Design an enzyme around this catalytic site. Sequence first.
Site, PDB file in Angstrom:
ATOM      1  N   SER A   1       0.706  -1.023   0.242  1.00 32.80           N
ATOM      2  CA  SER A   1       0.288   0.233  -0.130  1.00 32.80           C
ATOM      3  C   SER A   1       0.779   1.332  -0.103  1.00 32.80           C
ATOM      4  O   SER A   1       1.565   1.545  -1.266  1.00 32.80           O
ATOM      5  CB  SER A   1      -0.854  -0.289   1.201  1.00 32.80           C
ATOM      6  OG  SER A   1      -2.070   1.204   1.619  1.00 32.80           O
TER       7      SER A   1
ATOM      8  N   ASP B   1      -9.742  -4.426  -5.530  1.00 33.61           N
ATOM      9  CA  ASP B   1      -8.975  -2.698  -4.688  1.00 33.61           C
ATOM     10  C   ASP B   1      -8.871  -1.850  -5.596  1.00 33.61           C
ATOM     11  O   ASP B   1      -8.877  -1.292  -6.885  1.00 33.61           O
ATOM     12  CB  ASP B   1      -7.544  -3.317  -4.245  1.00 33.61           C
ATOM     13  CG  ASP B   1      -6.868  -2.399  -3.407  1.00 33.61           C
ATOM     14  OD1 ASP B   1      -7.038  -2.066  -3.333  1.00 33.61           O
ATOM     15  OD2 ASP B   1      -5.528  -3.024  -3.457  1.00 33.61           O
TER      16      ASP B   1
ATOM     17  N   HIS C   1      -7.930  -5.141  -1.092  1.00 34.82           N
ATOM     18  CA  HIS C   1      -6.689  -4.356   0.074  1.00 34.82           C
ATOM     19  C   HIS C   1      -6.354  -4.650   0.790  1.00 34.82           C
ATOM     20  O   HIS C   1      -7.063  -5.554   1.522  1.00 34.82           O
ATOM     21  CB  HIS C   1      -7.071  -3.370   0.210  1.00 34.82           C
ATOM     22  CG  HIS C   1      -5.764  -2.144  -0.435  1.00 34.82           C
ATOM     23  ND1 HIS C   1      -4.525  -1.447   1.063  1.00 34.82           N
ATOM     24  CD2 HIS C   1      -4.795  -1.486  -1.422  1.00 34.82           C
ATOM     25  CE1 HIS C   1      -4.173  -1.145   0.600  1.00 34.82           C
ATOM     26  NE2 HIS C   1      -4.228  -0.976  -0.109  1.00 34.82           N
TER      27      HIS C   1
END
Length: 297
Positions: free
Chosen positions: A147, A241, A271
């Site tokens: 991320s 995501d 995610h």
Amino acid sequence: MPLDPRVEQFLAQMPSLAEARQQFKQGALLLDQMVPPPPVDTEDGTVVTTHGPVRIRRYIPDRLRFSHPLVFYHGGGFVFGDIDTHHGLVARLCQTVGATVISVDYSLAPEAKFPVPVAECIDVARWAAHEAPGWGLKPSIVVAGDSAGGNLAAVVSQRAKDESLPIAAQLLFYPALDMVHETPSKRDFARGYLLEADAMQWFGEQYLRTPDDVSHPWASPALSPDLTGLPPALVITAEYDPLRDEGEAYAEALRAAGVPTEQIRFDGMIHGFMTMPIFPQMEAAIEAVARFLERID
Ligand SMILES: CCCC[C@H](CC)COC(=O)c1ccccc1C(=O)O
Ligand SMILES: CCCC[C@H](CC)CO
């Protein structure tokens, strides 16, 4: 492709700054207790950077079978997370790959603003390259992150050349890469899949100095026009995501620029899944990392 069954259930049963940080850390605790990490030797330390001391944790595998250190930058929107919240992932990376791993406690926003964490992450990478020969390893490092931390690994990799920094590979786990463009995935999965539009916006406000920072190459590495000669890349995405499309487009760009690239989408996933050990796909992705790194030397 349908939602993974366990993801579906997890999403169904899903219900101040300092409070919100503690809550995120609580969530990671409950996952670790549900699925304990492997035991692993670790030493805590501190690296002197150009923006101050940065705490690190070094992971030492039972058996060393990979000749480059990994430097790992945790995710959490530049605002949340630490070495503890990501222990579950890093311990598995360390033990499954059989690699030394330096997990980095970079400075969080809004107390530290862009680009402070980029500078810190580069400095720690530079330190690791220097120390590596002293550990009987190669000087070239592997950078890795999930991320926001995948954003940082992508930027550190683009800076590497210019900063005389030897990087042998980059491992990007559902990275944020493009803060300028809306993609189909960002539009279509903006709500209800754990990472949301509202959150991403708020995260950007905490991290960036001004709205102009979105087009800065150290915020949006996906905008960089020359990707030739960047380090070999593993790019892992989740099907559902918002960040998927920017990740997969960047992998396509790297590939067309002659960079050795593996792009893996985990279907049915969301995610965050590689710090959610309740999903077996977390371990599958970690195995993808070990197989990818086998090919590096
Ligand atoms: C000491 C209990 C912790 C408090 C939580 C918060 C609602 C409730 O406990 C559980 O349901 C639980 C327990 C261990 C691991 C995971 C969980 C879980 O939330 O899935
Ligand atoms: C920092 C998380 C991503 C930022 C967002 C992506 C479109 C824009 O503010």
